[PDB]
Design a protein around this nucleic acid. Structure first.
Ligand SMILES: [Mg+2]
Ligand SMILES: [Mg+2]
Ligand SMILES: [Mg+2]
Ligand SMILES: [Zn+2]
Ligand SMILES: [Zn+2]
Lengths: 14, 111, 220, 110, 170, 147, 1107, 96
DNA sequence: TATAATGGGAGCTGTCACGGATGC
DNA sequence: GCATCCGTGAGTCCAGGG
């Protein structure tokens, strides 16, 4: 829904 | 002839490219000093047509005797300026993108 | 020959409730909930209201103003919708050739005790200008198939109904017309503007939508 | 730049763009004035001979859009550049004489 | 939005005939301008179209025989009057304009009910049908005096009311 | 309307109500390409059923439908008319997928194109009429009679 | 002349300061007079205290602020299109926590607009009013669930944009949900986070039966506050990492952070009164000693369960009661935008605190300045001030809107918010509201009403102790009013004792008959029920409310006249309106007049000081009506404090003068007053009645171009000497010139755009041998239908204390005045809602006239009265007839005024004056008078057998007279009502509205005619106009409207040419806007193809778009 | 009302046909400068200027008054359009 | 061009009928 | 299938705009 929430999640993966 | 019907259909990528007179490659509009259109951007006479009737961008051709001539120095067809209302351009996407009408208008036609 | 009386009686201005408020009494008034308040204003406008009578009057005047305001937009919206369903309907030919029709009744059930004659205006709005779909013989008068009912023909049919000779009148109607994309001249009947058969080419759907929408602001 | 779709006022009634006139396309008045001009010039030109009317038209660009040089109009009519200059000048002399006589082109000059 | 069109405050005209309206001179000059330019050339009032146009441009340049020329321009022609909201077709009706001094449109009493117009400040728009065809449609089909019965009910719609009834009753 | 003293002729309401009953729903496709539950125009399913009866085939069983005025306007055949009304993107989406041809039958479609409307003086029933004076007509008749 | 006044109610108190709702609210917000250390934590001070300190290390803290003097006074701000404002400074100090270093400075924050004396603002030259907003008060509410009949919703509501709306509900499964930001979760969880145990919840709630059981969840009580808190942060922020300090921060910012949640003082007080608790601050919970502590939630749940069960003392709330709706005044509205600007400023501060190596360096004021400017220019409560007349301005400052930021959206507002609630009494006028779709959403403060410190509207009542009415008056909210039995102000008093056995009163709005013993309070005056405008309608008690509303509203639109008069029948409020609106100058103290001028008055006061008062003369209002003050004293005159020194606009000797008193006949007249049209006499023009002065402003700029500079000059190419006759040396029209449509006001030349002349132009130049000039005429000309006398020029050129926006070298403004005589199509009205357009101006010899030869002034139709039911205008006329012959005026207060018998006495006296004059001058009764008496006898209006004189007198006491038709000399066949009436000329003048176009400018994209008289626009032929043409079958007329007359480019050109040649118009082609539609669909990836009957494409673009 | 409007409506099967006939006739009179009129000199519609009485310039007024004489013929497919145009140019030459 | 620096802020409130989409 | 819970687009005309 929120593209920066999504991107912060993807980044918290690594 | 005479108009009797009006059809509406999906336009294919190839149909869209056939409409286009040029790809718009730069997000520029007009030059901040000359107030003339920047090359390969959203107002380019090279793509969308001349701003003045029967006159290329640089000035080498300025009469209706040349008609359909594409000037060699600037690249601008010599026709009526009215064509800046009619000539499409296009943006070639690096990756395909969905047309939201076919996504969000429920139920989704793609879905 | 009193001014208020002559204006009301002649139809020039004024109705009996407005006159009554002038010379009789203002009357009962509603609360903001819409329920009527127990005590009425007993003075007329000539005598003059009190502060409290005037304040309580406010609630109903404001409800009616807000009514009027909201209803002019609702009416216009309705008219737009009606124009959009009907705009293509046009008188496209003289006669579609249908044998179908409708029957307009002259009587309606009461207390369900019996049948009684419908009101005159209701019969006129159902029959005036219509084309007879079948021969009718009443009071020794032949009303032939294919005839446009004039207003005198309507009154004749009402008399026949009072004398017992007829209960329903078969009539060509847009409901039963078989013209594609429109209506025919027989099935539509008379151009009420002109008291004569409708001309082929009349934009009869637009006229219907406007006829229905234009009094919308009067519906309370 | 400011947006053409900037709201003017409280409602969504109107936008700044609504008030911007097209200055580019000729008005119906301007188009008709240009047309009456072309027709009056052709009328006044028909009072000259075919050659002086034609020389004026080639030299002013009223034919193919461009004004030819004296050498080109001369080579076209088979005649010296001086000769074509002299027949242009007598064509103008005739136009001016008629125009002073009838005052039929004055109002187009602004 | 549309050319050859105007609006103004409306005022009752009792002396009008049913097929007439009162149209202010200055509005009529602007609404009919090309016709007037032509007709002025057709007389000596200006050599040509463009002289005539410059003449009408300034108000203190406007002569007198121009009003006479205008009167010949509108002869037998009709304008369309419109009062919004246009709820049924009789919100638009055709009228032969009579030129008046003043800046108000003069409206005939018997068409007020159909326009739902009265004179507590209403305004109306006016429009010029241009071609022979539009003008013929307006004079045959849309003339006030050819539209007397309601298309909704068949009953008279142009009909006595208020003072007219009051005097006849009296 | 009667309650308010408004006299309104029934046939206007009947015109509208006829448009509300325009559509039907298929109950059995018969020998047709149609589907069960498909909604289409009563006119069209009747034309198809007579084409199938003339062809000796089984006709399509269908039930009548009632639509409100809004839905009936949106369901109309002409995509220019429906898209000018409401739900523009939905209308245009389905018309584009189907490749719809608007035949310019009604009034809205022709108004949008700036065409002469098929009503009144634009009706095909009257617009081809000719006028000629007695003298000119007689002269044309002499011209004909020579050849 | 003599003023006789009626009525027996003596008002204990005068009206309060009628603009205090503006003035006091803004003074409270700015605290400009208060020494900094004494300020309260309210207004912009409170904004500062919420923003600062700014932490994270570095800290930037607030000490105090200061407001300096305005750089320009008010008139200069109007003249130069400036904002009247004061510089804002703040003293700030930067502390580094570890170093201990402290840097302190006074930083400049921009400017704050100042309120003028009358309560308005000057934003970029134009006067503006911030209109107060009405909204639901913050607090705790309980309302019926519209779905489940026995269940109730609880609603916790903070100040707007100061927290979320929280709802509690009892779910059909019995668990009590909480909804915030549209998230239905079980409340038990939050209760646990607060620190509540099942023991405390059992002992505190079990009384209400099984309800408490839907609250008991063991999986919740089995978790400590930390685990519940993390659980809530997860089900509130899906995907956000459930970090502990992040969950604390979020819930604290949601429920406990005063800088983010605020019930306001009003929401605090009402939540406390409703729930019967005490609040520490203004938030739902606190963070104390590392844990959350409840304030509101458990009391709210307690109440909700008690209401659901049925236990007494628990009731649902009426959300439209004026104890639950409050007023946000200008001070609060502005403070909120100030708080937003300060929040953005603080974000910039924290940003520069990260990136950097001083308070000034850290502070960028721009966001703050942007927010204030945004409030004062583009807000819906920031309104162009209406100053048509001075009452207009006063009324504008007292308006109340339910719209605006944080309010209602029209087209959605239901019937409830628009209703007049019982509690509006004495608070909000019940008649004065708009007639369009905004009806009931914009309102006016009642004359005696006051907005209290919390924002609730209070009205005054007198105390009654054992039947005695005291002079103690008490201002109450509607909640307090509901406690008492309150008597009506017309209750008969003998001295101070209620002299009646039965008393009309109200209990909670309900009318009730009551003994004197039971009376606790009594209204101050009928005046307190109505707005100021409604309080100016005499005989209001005889006017149906619907037309009273119109008379109210139209007083706002009255034009100030050059010979304005106060009404002959007044209500007694006219002087106070002139006073409170600053529509006049008054003496400051006792004194003597030393100098008197058209321009100024010098007064010598008792102190010996010599005070000079400049008079504003022919100034331009926001609406172009004329603001000028005229002296009403003379040299040597002795003045006491408060005496009138000068009349402003619509002021006659200090009385509100909104129109003229004219002699009126009520009768039909030949169709010319049909359907509310009005007939008037040419006499009115002859004596400049209804003449008004209007001033228009025109403006022109000369700027630098890339093509060379625009110049304001007299040397304009191709113009005659006649065209330049009245242009000054520099090319500006001279003061006093008469300018008509077409005439130049400011000459200007612009360099031409680079163009190769068309060959026709080359040839025409050669024929006349004239070099085309290099500049063209771009002058400012008087537009169509305008003109007048030039009365001022202003000339601001760069290089001169003058600096303009970049690239403009000079601005010129020309002021033009017109005297506007009444004309056909102008709108007249009276205070009872009778309104009409002038349809006919008759010469005097055509006017109906009295036997003594006096013609009447205006003829109003009787058909306008019966269905309108506004009989006040008839009584006014009757009393006007009396006043006409007695040379007197009257004050008839509303609901306390002249009654028919007293009017009849006055008409008997006036008759003696009107008729005994004749009987003395040597004349008897006329034959025509005898014919009219014969008819009157048959109408029942006169007693048969009495003499001519006695019957004429009976008619006169009915307010009727014999009247002669000026065209015939024959009498009107019945006697006619004649009298003086107060009639205003409204600001709807046909001079401003008439407009026509043949051709003109077209729009850029659509190529359709522009809209608007100033753009020389065309009329909209909309969807419904099209339907009308379709229904007539007028196919070609319609096709013209859609093509040749709008956006068919070749069609419009060719039709113009054909007409000017006398040919017929050509056949239309495609409108341009359909081409635009096709291209806009092609951009949507749709291929829209015009086919022919063989299904082959047809190109509507004539090849110009195909490669 | 237009003079004779009730008879004009009597002549046609559809009111819109009268408007088509009237408009086409008006265009024909304008095209040929009124030389093709079926009116006799005393039947010509007149307009009162200040100078005196002259021909009414309005071709729709003319066309209606001509229709009312029975001297016009109207209907569909009377003559091919180009033959009609060319014969009217022959009988009544257009101004140049 | 090199000390080291590693997951964001904003919300926001008095409508309504209706077609399609999710839980029972 | 049968209800509920959602999104979404809609709301007379003109005028001027600060
Ligand atoms: Mg009105
Ligand atoms: Mg209003
Ligand atoms: Mg408004
Ligand atoms: Zn080039
Ligand atoms: Zn049929």
């Amino acid at each position: 829904s929120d593209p920066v929430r999504q991107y912060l999640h993807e980044i918290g993966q690594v | 002839k005479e108009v009797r019907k009006v059809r509406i259909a999906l336009a294919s990528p190839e149909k869209i490219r056939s409409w286009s007179y040029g790809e718009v490659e730069k997000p520029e509009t007009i030059n901040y000093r000359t107030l003339k259109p920047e090359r390969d951007g959203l107002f380019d006479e090279r793509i969308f047509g001349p701003i003045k009737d029967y006159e290329c961008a640089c000035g080498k051709y300025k009469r209706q005797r040349f008609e359909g001539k594409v000037c060699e120095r600037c690249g601008v067809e010599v026709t009526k300026s009215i064509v800046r209302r009619y000539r499409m351009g296009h943006i070639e996407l690096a990756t395909p993108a969905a047309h939201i009408w076919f996504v969000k208008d429920v139920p989704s036609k793609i879905g | 020959f009193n001014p208020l009386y002559v204006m009301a009686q002649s139809g020039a201005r004024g109705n009996p409730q407005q006159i009554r408020q002038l010379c009789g009494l203002r009357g009962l008034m509603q609360k903001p909930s819409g329920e009527t308040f127990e005590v009425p204003v007993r003075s007329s406008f000539r005598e003059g209201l009190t502060v409290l009578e005037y304040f309580i009057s406010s609630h109903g005047a404001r409800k009616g103003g807000a009514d009027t305001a909201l209803r002019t937009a609702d009416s216009g919206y309705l008219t737009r919708k009606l124009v959009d369903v009907t705009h293509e309907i046009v008188v496209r030919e003289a006669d579609c050739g249908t044998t179908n029709y409708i029957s307009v009744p002259l009587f309606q059930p009461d207390v369900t005790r019996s049948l009684r004659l419908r009101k005159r205006a209701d019969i006129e709005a159902g029959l005036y200008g219509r084309v007879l779909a079948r021969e009718v013989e009443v009071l020794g008068v032949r009303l032939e198939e294919g005839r446009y009912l004039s207003m005198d023909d309507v009154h004749l049919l009402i008399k026949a109904a009072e004398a017992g000779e007829i209960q329903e009148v078969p009539v060509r109607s847009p409901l039963t017309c078989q013209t594609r994309y429109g209506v025919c001249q027989k099935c539509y009947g008379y151009d009420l503007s002109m008291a004569r058969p409708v001309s082929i080419g009349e934009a009869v759907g637009i006229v219907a939508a406007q006829s229905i929408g234009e009094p919308g602001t009067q519906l309370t | 730049p400011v947006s053409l779709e900037t709201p003017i006022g409280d409602e969504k009634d109107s936008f700044y763009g609504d008030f911007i006139p097209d200055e580019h396309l000729p008005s119906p008045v301007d188009a008709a004035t240009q047309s009456l001009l072309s027709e009056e010039l052709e009328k006044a030109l028909s009072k000259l001979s075919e050659r002086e009317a034609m020389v004026l038209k080639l030299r002013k660009g009223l034919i193919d859009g461009r004004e030819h040089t004296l050498e080109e109009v001369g080579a076209f009519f088979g005649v010296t550049r001086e000769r074509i200059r002299q027949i242009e000048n007598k064509a103008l002399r005739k136009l001016k004489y008629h125009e002073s006589r009838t005052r039929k082109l004055r109002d187009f000059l602004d | 939005r549309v050319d050859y069109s105007g609006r103004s405050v409306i005022v009752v005209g009792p002396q009008l005939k049913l097929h007439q309206c009162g149209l202010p001179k200055r509005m009529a000059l602007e609404l009919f301008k090309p016709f007037l330019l032509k007709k002025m050339e057709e007389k000596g009032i200006a050599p040509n179209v463009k002289a005539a146009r410059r003449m009408l441009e300034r108000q203190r340049d406007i002569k007198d025989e121009v009003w006479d020329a205008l009167e010949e321009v509108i002869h037998g022609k009709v304008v369309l009057l419109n009062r919004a909201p246009t709820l049924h077709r009789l919100g638009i009706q055709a009228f032969q304009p009579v030129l008046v001094e003043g800046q108000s449109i003069q409206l005939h009493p018997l068409v007020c009910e159909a326009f739902n117009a009265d004179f507590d400040g209403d305004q109306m728009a006016v429009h010029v049908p241009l071609s022979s065809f539009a003008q013929a449609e307006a004079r045959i089909q849309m003339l006030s005096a050819h539209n007397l019965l309601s298309p909704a009910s068949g009953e008279p719609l142009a009909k006595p009311s208020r003072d007219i009834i009051l005097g006849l009753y009296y | 309307y009667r309650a308010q003293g408004v006299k309104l002729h029934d046939k206007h309401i009947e015109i509208v109500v006829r448009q509300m009953m325009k559509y039907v729903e298929v109950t059995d496709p018969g020998d047709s390409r149609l589907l069960e539950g498909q909604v289409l125009e009563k006119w069209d399913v009747e034309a198809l059923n007579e084409r199938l009866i003339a062809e000796g085939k089984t006709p399509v069983a269908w039930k009548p439908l009632l639509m409100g005025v809004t839905k009936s306007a949106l369901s109309t055949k002409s995509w220019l008319s429906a898209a000018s009304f409401q739900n523009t993107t939905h209308v245009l989406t389905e018309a584009a997928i189907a490749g719809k041809k608007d035949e310019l039958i009604g009034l809205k479609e022709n108004v949008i194109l700036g065409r002469l409307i098929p009503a009144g003086t634009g009706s095909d029933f009257v617009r081809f009429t000719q006028v000629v004076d007695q003298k000119t007509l007689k002269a044309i008749e002499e011209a004909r009679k020579e050849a | 002349m003599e003023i006789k006044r009626f009525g027996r109610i003596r008002e204990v108190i005068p009206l309060p300061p009628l603009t205090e709702i503006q003035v006091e609210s803004y003074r409270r917000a700015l605290q400009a007079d208060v020494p900094p250390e004494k300020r309260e934590n309210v207004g912009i001070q409170a904004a500062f205290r919420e923003t600062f300190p700014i932490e994270e290390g570095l800290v930037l803290d607030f000490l105090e602020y200061r407001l300096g003097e305005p750089p320009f006074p008010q008139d200069e701000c109007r003249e130069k299109d400036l904002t009247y404002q004061a510089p804002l400074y703040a003293r700030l100090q930067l502390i580094h926590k570890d170093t201990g270093l402290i840097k302190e400075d006074e930083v400049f924050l921009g400017h704050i607009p100042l309120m003028t004396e009358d309560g308005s603002f000057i934003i970029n030259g134009a006067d503006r009013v911030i209109v107060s907003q009405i909204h639901r008060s913050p607090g705790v509410y309980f309302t019926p669930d519209p779905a489940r009949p026995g269940r109730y919703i609880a609603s916790i509501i903070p100040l707007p944009k100061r927290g979320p709306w929280i709802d509690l509900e009892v779910e059909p499964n019995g668990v009590v949900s909480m909804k915030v930001n549209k998230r239905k979760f079980p409340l038990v969880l939050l209760l646990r986070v607060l620190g509540y145990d099942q023991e405390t919840l059992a002992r505190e709630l079990g009384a209400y039966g099984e309800l408490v059981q839907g609250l008991m969840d063991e999986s919740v009580f089995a978790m400590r506050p930390e685990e519940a808190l993390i659980r809530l942060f997860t089900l509130l922020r899906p995907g956000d990492p459930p970090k502990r300090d992040k969950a604390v921060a979020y819930v604290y910012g949601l429920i406990a952070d005063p800088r983010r949640y605020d019930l306001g003082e009003a929401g605090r007080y009402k939540a406390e009164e409703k729930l019967g608790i005490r609040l520490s601050g203004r938030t739902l919970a606190r963070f104390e000693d590392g844990e959350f502590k409840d304030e509101v939630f458990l009391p709210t749940l307690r109440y909700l369960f008690a209401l659901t069960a049925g236990v007494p003392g628990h009731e649902v709330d009426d959300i439209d009661h004026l104890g639950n709706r409050r007023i946000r005044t200008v001070g609060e509205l502005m403070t909120d935008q100030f708080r937003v600007g300060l929040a953005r400023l603080a974000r910039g501060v924290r940003e520069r605190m990260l990136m950097g190596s001083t308070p000034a360096k850290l502070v960028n004021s721009r966001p703050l300045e942007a927010a204030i400017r945004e409030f004062f220019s583009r807000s819906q409560l920031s309104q162009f001030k209406d100053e048509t007349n001075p009452l207009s301005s006063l009324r504008h400052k007292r308006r109340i809107s339910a719209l605006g930021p944080g309010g209602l959206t029209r087209e959605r507002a239901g019937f409830d918010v628009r209703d007049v609630h019982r509690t509006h009494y004495g608070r909000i006028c019940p008649v004065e509201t708009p007639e369009g779709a905004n009806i009931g959403l914009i309102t006016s403060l009642a004359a005696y009403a006051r907005v209290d410190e919390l924002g609730f509207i209070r009205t005054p009542y007198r105390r009654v102790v054992g039947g005695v009415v005291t002079d103690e008056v008490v201002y109450m909210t509607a909640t307090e009013e509901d406690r008492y039995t309150i008597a009506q102000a017309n209750t008969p008093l003998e001295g101070n004792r209620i002299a009646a056995e039965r008393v009309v009163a109200r209990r909670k709005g309900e009318p009730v008959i009551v003994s004197p013993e039971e009376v606790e309070f009594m209204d101050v005056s009928p005046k307190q029920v109505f707005s100021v405008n409604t309080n100016l309608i005499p005989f209001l008690e005889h006017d149906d409310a619907n037309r009273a509303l119109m008379g109210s509203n139209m007083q706002t639109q009255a034009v100030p006249l050059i010979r304005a008069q106060a009404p002959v029948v007044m209500t007694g409020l006219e002087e106070r309106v002139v006073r409170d609106s600053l529509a006049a100058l008054y003496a400051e103290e006792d004194g003597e007049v030393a100098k008197v001028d058209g321009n100024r008055i010098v007064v010598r006061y008792e102190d010996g000081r010599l005070v000079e008062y400049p008079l504003r003369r022919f100034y331009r209002s926001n609406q172009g009506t004329a603001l000028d003050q005229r002296p009403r004293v003379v040299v040597g005159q002795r003045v006491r404090k408060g005496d009138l020194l000068a009349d402003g606009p619509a002021s006659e000797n200090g009385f509100l003068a909104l129109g003229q008193n004219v002699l009126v006949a009520i009768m039909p007249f030949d169709g010319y007053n049909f359907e509310d049209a009005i007939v008037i006499s040419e006499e009115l023009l002859k004596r400049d009645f209804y003449t008004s002065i209007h001033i228009e402003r025109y403006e022109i700029e000369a700027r630098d171009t890339k093509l060379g500079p625009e110049r304001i000059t007299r040397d304009i190419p191709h113009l005659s000497e006649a065209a330049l006759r009245d242009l000054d040396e520099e090319g500006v029209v001279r003061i006093g010139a008469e300018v008509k449509p077409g005439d130049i006001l400011v000459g200007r030349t612009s360099f031409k755009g680079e163009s190769e002349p068309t060959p026709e132009e080359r040839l025409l130049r050669s024929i006349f041998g004239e070099k085309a000039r290099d500049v063209k005429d771009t002058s400012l000309r008087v537009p169509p239908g305008e003109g007048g006398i030039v009365v001022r020029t202003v000339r601001l050129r760069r290089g001169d204390g003058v600096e303009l926006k970049p690239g403009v070298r000079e601005v010129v403004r020309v002021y033009v005045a017109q005297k506007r005589k009444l004309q056909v199509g102008d709108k007249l009205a009276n205070r009872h809602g009778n309104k009409g357009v002038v349809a006919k101006i008759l010469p005097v010899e055509d006017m109906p006239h009295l036997p003594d030869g006096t013609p009447v002034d205006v003829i109003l139709n009787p058909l306008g009265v019966p269905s309108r039911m506004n009989l006040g205008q008839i009584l006014e006329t009757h009393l006007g007839l009396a006043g006409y012959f007695l040379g007197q005026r009257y004050i008839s207060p509303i609901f306390d005024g002249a009654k028919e018998p007293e009017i009849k006495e006055l008409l008997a006296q006036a008759f003696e004056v009107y008729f005994g004059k004749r009987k003395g001058e040597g004349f008897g009764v006329d034959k025509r008078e005898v014919e009219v008496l014969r008819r009157a006898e048959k109408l029942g209006l006169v007693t048969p057998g009495k003499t001519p004189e006695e019957q004429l007198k009976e008619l006169f006491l009915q307010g009727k007279v014999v009247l002669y038709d000026g065209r015939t000399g024959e009498p009107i066949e019945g006697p006619i009502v004649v009298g003086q009436m107060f009639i205003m000329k409204l600001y709807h003048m046909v001079e401003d509205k008439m407009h026509a176009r043949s051709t003109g400018p077209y729009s850029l994209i659509t190529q359709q005619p522009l809209g608007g008289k100033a753009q020389f626009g065309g009329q909209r032929f909309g969807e419904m106009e099209v339907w009308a043409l379709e229904a007539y079958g007028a196919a070609h007329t319609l096709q013209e409207m859609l093509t040749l007359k709008s956006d068919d480019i070749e069609g419009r050109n060719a039709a113009y040419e054909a007409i000017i040649k006398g040919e017929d118009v050509p056949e239309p082609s495609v409108p341009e806007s359909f081409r635009v539609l096709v291209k806009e669909l092609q951009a949507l990836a749709l291929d829209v193809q015009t086919l022919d009957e063989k299904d082959n494409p047809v190109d509507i673009f004539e090849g110009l778009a195909s490669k | 009302a237009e003079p004779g409007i009730d008879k004009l409506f009597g002549m046609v099967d559809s009111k819109y046909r009268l408007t088509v006939v009237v408009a086409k006739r008006a265009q024909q009179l304008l095209r040929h400068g009124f030389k093709n009129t079926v009116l006799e000199p005393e039947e010509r519609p007149k307009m009162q200027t200040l100078e005196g009485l002259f021909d009414d310039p309005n071709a729709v007024t003319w066309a209606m008054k001509e229709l009312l004489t029975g001297r016009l013929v109207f209907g569909e497919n009377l003559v091919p359009e180009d033959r009609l145009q060319k014969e009217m140019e022959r009988l009544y030459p257009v101004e140049r």
